[PDB]
Amino acid sequence: HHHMTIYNINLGIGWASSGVEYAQAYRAGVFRKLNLSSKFIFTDMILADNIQHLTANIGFDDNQVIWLYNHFTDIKIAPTSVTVDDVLAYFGGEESHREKNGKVLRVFFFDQDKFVTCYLVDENKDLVQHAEYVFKGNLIRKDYFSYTRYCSEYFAPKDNVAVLYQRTFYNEDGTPVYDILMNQGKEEVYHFKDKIFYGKQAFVRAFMKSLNLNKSDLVILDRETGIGQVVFEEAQTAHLAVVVHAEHYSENATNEDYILWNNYYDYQFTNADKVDFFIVSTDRQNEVLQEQFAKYTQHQPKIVTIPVGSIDSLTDSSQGRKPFSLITASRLAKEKHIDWLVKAVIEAHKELPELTFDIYGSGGEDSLLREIIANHQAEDYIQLKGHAELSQIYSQYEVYLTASTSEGFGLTLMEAIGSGLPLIGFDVPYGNQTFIEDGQNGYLIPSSSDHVEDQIKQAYAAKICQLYQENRLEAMRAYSYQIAEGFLTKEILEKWKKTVEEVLHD
Ligand SMILES: O=c1ccn([C@@H]2O[C@H](COP(=O)(O)OP(=O)(O)O)[C@@H](O)[C@H]2O)c(=O)[nH]1
Ligand SMILES: CC(=O)N[C@@H]1[C@@H](O)[C@H](O)[C@@H](CO)O[C@H]1O
């Protein structure tokens, strides 16, 4: 490549990803619009799914995607198109019968000692994402497929448990490119046939060098656990930007003489002299971080404010908004405190029996949330919707609720106001203070460090009730759209263009 390329580095991606991954997807949308060459690199081993299925889901174009382990081969990022028949060709013939159970297809043979389990992309299609080969009860090999087999895993029995010892990655023609020798989940040795790498760091270094980075390239680092030093070192011949996503230090641990950074930034902040610029989503975080660099460190890095999201256009309700309908959208994670919202809604429902509350997202808090709902017999008006595509969802509702105690930005807050939702949330930095004008487009609720649950639920309940009882909904929605005009894609393109124009040239 001769053209400027923007390389973006993250660990992983899933069906129900965090805002970090969605922010990357927003950024990809911007780079496409600016007709700029970009790559989004993921460094995690992802085998449970075809990585292309995940990236396409979130909206990356296939040619914007680099997967670390695939990169050294000539197999392109692609959807799974291998069939059951294609799969069975890798294993010996003579099928006796099958068993199907959803996506799990087990193919039995007359050789009673062997069977193949296929894991289908779609229960009602014959596309096979990966397959498992079992001999006399023992798992021996797993193959992984896109348009051909790109990876095999090799297993041997120990105490009757299958132990992974080797992973091999292939080229299109079926020849192996490299083997990873495994030890209890650690990728210890990467054997490239004519050379060898010891440890993932060395492997990632080789990857970085394989990019042939030019001075006019930009490396943007989103997440970096395990690989920071190698990325930092190899990015010096290009330009290096670090995106700060969440709150970046611990207030409770910090005092006049000592600061405790967020673990995901400690490395980057310690070595800020190696970073060309940091990116933050709000000016308040910008100023906070700048001050802390001056107060606690010997660095004075460049820090630019670029929102991680933008709104293409405001979205109007297409068929109207259900009366008294409430929405929240997040990972079901402790730091979002959706349980406080559920209890608040149960309470407000005493005064407004028409209230409903839909909860979008996935996460380990689902068990607690179901328990609270069951305990109050609230199933008919409070529901978990799962992780969904939200673009058409928000404008079907009246008001958005958040009990998150901290947001670097909060993409669902931006998305919510872009669809004309008033917001009710805690008066906490940074996102809530960016997106909520108390009394104009919703309410900011004072937060306390002791976090008394009874007080919290009473406050949210009171505020929800007040919005409806004082007839504030029309005015607040209108004000949300007004705030949202400050977060439109047109503005953001210019911010990126400007930043890109400054890394290109000087
Ligand atoms: O059911 C859901 C819930 C969330 N999201 C997306 O996940 C991202 C969450 O980002 P945010 O900044 O709100 O929270 P984070 O997960 O970063 O704390 C947003 O872009 C949402 O649109 C989604 O697509 N479907
Ligand atoms: C809890 C928290 O701070 N989450 C931040 C979010 O506010 C921000 O929108 C996103 C994308 O930058 O990074 C997140 O993970």
Three-state SS string over 78-105 comes to: CCCCCEHHHHHCCCCCCEEEEEEECCEE
Residues lining ligand 2, CB < 6 A? 18-20, 23, 245-247, 281, 308, 335, 406-411, 431
Domain span including residue 188: 77-199
CA 139 and chain centroid, separation: 32
249, β-bridge pairs? 261
Residues 280 and 344 in one domain: no
What are the residues whose beta carbons fall under 8 Å from the beta carbon of 291, sequence distance 6 or more?
Answer: none
Residues 492 and 480 in one domain: no
The number of residues in the chain equals 506
For the chain, how big is the Rg over CA atoms in Å?
25
Residues 52 and 16 in one domain: yes
Residues 104 and 142 in one domain: yes
Q: What is the DSSP letter of 446?
A: P
Residues 291 and 387 in one domain: no
Q: How many whole angstroms separate alpha carbon 432 and alpha carbon 423?
A: 9
Q: Using alpha carbons, select from 479, 405, 408, 491 the residue that is nearest to residue 448.
A: 405
Q: How many whole angstroms separate alpha carbon 190 and alpha carbon 73?
A: 14
CA 50 and chain centroid, separation: 16
Mutate to test the pocket of ligand 2, among 24, 27, 279, 308 (most ligand atoms within 8 A of CB): 308
Residues 35 and 150 in one domain: no
* Ligand 2 centroid, distance to 104 Cα (angstroms): 36
Q: How many whole angstroms separate alpha carbon 59 and alpha carbon 155?
A: 35
User: Is residue 415 within 8 Å of 421, Cβ to Cβ?
Assistant: no
Residues 480 and 335 in one domain: yes
Tell me how many domains the chain contains.
Answer: 3
* Ligand 1 centroid, distance to 412 Cα (angstroms): 6
Q: Is the CB of 390 within 6 Å of ligand 1?
A: yes
User: For the chain, how many helices (H) and strands (E)?
Assistant: 15, 23
Biggest CA pair distance of the chain: 75
Q: How many whole angstroms separate alpha carbon 487 and alpha carbon 473?
A: 21
Mutate to test the pocket of ligand 1, among 22, 243, 308, 332 (most ligand atoms within 8 A of CB): 22
Q: Which of 170, 199, 228 is the last residue of a domain?
A: 199
360, β-bridge pairs? 329, 386
User: In this structure, which residue's CA is closest to atom 10 in ligand 2?
Assistant: 19
Q: What experimental approach yielded this model?
A: X-ray
Residues 192 and 331 in one domain: no
Q: How many whole angstroms separate alpha carbon 248 and alpha carbon 263?
A: 8
- Pick the atom of ligand 2 nearest to 281's CA: 12
Q: How many whole angstroms separate alpha carbon 419 and alpha carbon 248?
A: 29
Q: Is the CB of 387 within 6 Å of ligand 1?
A: yes
Q: Among positive and negative, which fits the CA dihedral 61, 67, 70, 74?
A: positive
Q: Is the CB of 153 within 6 Å of ligand 1?
A: no
Strands 442-445 and 423-426: parallel
Strands 128-135 and 325-329: unpaired
Residues 273 and 292 in one domain: yes
Residues 439 and 497 in one domain: no
Q: Which of 165, 199, 233 is the last residue of a domain?
A: 199
Residues 48 and 110 in one domain: no
User: In this structure, which residue's CA is closest to atom 17 in ligand 1?
Assistant: 19
Residue 55, judged by CB atoms within 10 A of its CB (0-12, 13-18, 19+), counts as buried
Mutate to test the pocket of ligand 1, among 223, 330, 362 (most ligand atoms within 8 A of CB): 330
Q: Is the CB of 29 within 6 Å of ligand 1?
A: no
Only one residue has tokens 């008394």, namely 452
Q: How many whole angstroms separate alpha carbon 321 and alpha carbon 218?
A: 43
8, β-bridge pairs? 40, 220
Q: Is the CB of 307 within 6 Å of ligand 1?
A: no
Q: Which of 199, 224, 245 is the last residue of a domain?
A: 199
- At residue 491, what is the residue type? E
Instruction: Specify the CATH number for the domain of residue 410.
Output: 3.40.50.2000
Residues 339 and 431 in one domain: yes
What are the residues whose beta carbons fall under 8 Å from the beta carbon of 196, sequence distance 6 or more?
Answer: 189, 190
Q: How many whole angstroms separate alpha carbon 139 and alpha carbon 156?
A: 7
Q: Residue 22 — φ and ψ, nearest 5°?
A: -65, -40
Residue 225 vs residues 43, 172, 193, 415, 460: alpha-carbon distances, Å: 10, 31, 28, 29, 37
